[PDB]
Design a protein around this ligand. Structure first.
Ligand SMILES: [Cu+2]
Ligand SMILES: [Cu+2]
Length: 128
C-alpha cells in the first residue's frame, strides 16, 4: 500500500503521470512534485491541485484570474481539497492530505492552475 506518488511537470506542459489511485487503507496521501524543465515559474510554473472533477473548471477559471502572486489559486477556495505550491525549473514541493477528504465512487482530478496548462496538465485521482 503505497501512500505517495512522485510527479514531474516539464516545459511541454505535461505531467509524467496521468492517473492516481489512492488506497483506502491510507490515512494520508503524499504527492511529490518536481520540475525537470529549464523555464521559471512565471512562464512554465506548475502546481498539483486537487478537486472533484465537477469543481475543476471553476477552480482553474478562478485560479488563473488570481495572478502569479496568489499562486494561481482563488484565496481560500473551498473547492481545493489539497495543493502543492507553484514551482519552476529545478524547484520541487510536496503535499500531504487526509484521505478522509476523499470518498468512494466520485471522480477526482489533479491539474495545474497556471494559465492554460490544465488543457493537458490534468489527470484522474480515485479512492479505491
Ligand atoms: Cu503548469
Ligand atoms: Cu477511512
Amino acid at each position: 500500500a503505497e501512500c505517495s506518488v512522485d510527479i514531474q511537470g516539464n516545459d511541454q506542459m505535461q505531467f509524467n503521470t496521468n492517473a492516481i489511485t489512492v488506497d483506502k487503507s491510507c490515512k494520508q496521501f503524499t504527492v511529490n512534485l518536481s520540475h525537470p524543465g529549464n523555464l521559471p515559474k512565471n512562464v512554465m510554473g506548475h502546481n498539483w491541485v486537487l478537486s472533484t472533477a465537477a469543481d475543476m473548471q471553476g477552480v482553474v477559471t478562478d485560479g488563473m484570474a488570481s495572478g502569479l502572486d496568489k499562486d494561481y489559486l482563488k484565496p481560500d477556495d473551498s473547492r481545493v481539497i489539497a495543493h502543492t505550491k507553484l514551482i519552476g525549473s529545478g524547484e520541487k514541493d510536496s503535499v500531504t492530505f487526509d484521505v478522509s477528504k476523499l470518498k468512494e465512487g466520485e471522480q477526482y482530478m489533479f491539474f495545474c492552475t497556471f494559465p492554460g496548462h490544465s488543457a493537458l496538465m490534468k489527470g484522474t485521482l480515485t479512492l479505491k
